Amino acid sequence: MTEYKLVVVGAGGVGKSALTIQLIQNHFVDEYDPTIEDSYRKQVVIDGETCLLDILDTAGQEEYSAMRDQYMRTGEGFLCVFAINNTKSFEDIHHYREQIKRVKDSEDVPMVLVGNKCDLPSRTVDTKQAQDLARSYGIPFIETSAKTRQRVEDAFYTLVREIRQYRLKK
Amino acid sequence: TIRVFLPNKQRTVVNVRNGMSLHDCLMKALKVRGLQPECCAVFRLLHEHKGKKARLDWNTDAASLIGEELQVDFLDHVPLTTHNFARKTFLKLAFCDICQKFLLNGFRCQTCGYKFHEHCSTKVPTMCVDWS
Ligand SMILES: Nc1nc2c(ncn2[C@@H]2O[C@H](COP(=O)(O)OP(=O)(O)NP(=O)(O)O)[C@@H](O)[C@H]2O)c(=O)[nH]1
Ligand SMILES: [Mg+2]
Ligand SMILES: [Zn+2]
Ligand SMILES: [Zn+2]
């Protein structure tokens, strides 16, 4: 059984934990419990293949110690989550992109841009802004909603397919 | 803070409030991972040769364990394990255990027999229950 080590990064309060728990439990966490470090493991089926997802939920403002540079080195795919009602969280996406590319010392790192909280009507980050940022990176962009579970499986399954295609480099 | 290792190669880091028991600190982390405190026990990891971990009561104050590293493990002989999925074509009429719809080409756990669609895989319970 093949394994995929996913890492969820983003600013604080963008819904990193809500998207992960919605995937493995189909339960929407309504409260705000700031994460420190949480590892999950769930068996799913993606494109007819039994996959073992090893998801690591990170903190919003994580300590820049050897612990942060270590999980980025052992991570195989990165989910970059921002809230559409938080423009500052979308601006922080650029830093996560360049930070992952420096710790791994490579390019073509499997990555997916995720715009969360699309159920709210107070949108401050236009969809054109995110698609322009994602197309310049060569990574897919997906709008998600952990509250109503909209394209939550599509966000993680897309990242897994990005790792599958990246593993076929030979 | 306290680093707590959880069953099935998982882990979490919890904040320490004085007076809060270990059960109340790890309750949400266990429920989210499909685990129940009734089937688990919390241990304090030792760093010597004689013994790897020492069991602690679930009501122990987490403040008395700052600087330590904890580990939650299943109790002895609990009927919980990991699933073993496999493709299967259901010649005898079968329905998905998640959506109760017709299941022709799906998946099945070789141990507990949980049958489901491809798109229903996330709703499958995390832990495999086998009572012989
Ligand atoms: N309306 C709505 N609220 C959401 C959505 N996703 C998350 N939230 C809410 O946003 C708040 C913060 O969510 P959370 O998952 O904890 O965010 P986080 O990215 O893990 N934060 P941290 O890095 O501090 O741990 C919670 O109150 C949660 O209910 C969504 O899609 N829609
Ligand atoms: Mg979180
Ligand atoms: Zn099973
Ligand atoms: Zn089904």
Author numbering:
A (entry chain A): 1 to 170
B (entry chain B): 57 to 188
What do the authors of the reporting publication say about this deposited model?
KRAS, the most frequently mutated oncogene in human cancer, produces two isoforms, KRAS4a and KRAS4b, through alternative splicing. These isoforms differ in exon 4, which encodes the final 15 residues of the G-domain and hypervariable regions (HVRs), vital for trafficking and membrane localization. RAS proteins act as binary switches, transitioning between the active [guanosine triphosphate (GTP)–bound] and inactive [guanosine diphosphate (GDP)–bound] forms. We present the structures of both the active and inactive forms of KRAS4a, as well as of the complex between KRAS4a and the primary effector protein RAF1 and compare them to previously reported KRAS4b structures.
To gain insights into the interaction between KRAS4a with its downstream effector RAF kinase, we solved the structures of KRAS4a bound to the RAS-binding domain (RBD) of RAF1 at 1.65-Å resolution and bound to the RBD and cysteine-rich domain (RBD-CRD) at 2.65-Å resolution. Strand β2 of the RBD contacts the N-terminal section of strand β2 of KRAS4a to create an extended β sheet bridging the two proteins, whereas the RAF1 CRD interacts with KRAS4a residues located on the interswitch region and helix α5. The CRD of RAF1 interacts with position 153 on the KRAS α5 helix, one of the six residues that differ between the G-domains of KRAS4a and KRAS4b. The longer side chain of E153 in KRAS4a versus D153 in KRAS4b displaces the RAF1 CRD in complex with KRAS4a by 1.5 to 3 Å compared to the CRD’s position when bound to KRAS4b. HRAS, like KRAS4a, has glutamate at position 153, and the HRAS:RAF1 RBD-CRD complex shows a very similar displacement of the CRD to that observed in the KRAS4a complex. These structural analyses demonstrate that the interaction of KRAS4a with RAF1 RBD-CRD is more similar to HRAS than the KRAS4b complexes with RAF1 RBD-CRD. We, therefore, propose that position 153 fine-tunes the interaction of RAS with the CRD of RAF kinase. The longer side chain at position 153 in KRAS4a and HRAS displaces the RAF1-CRD by 1.5 to 3 Å compared to its position bound to KRAS4b.
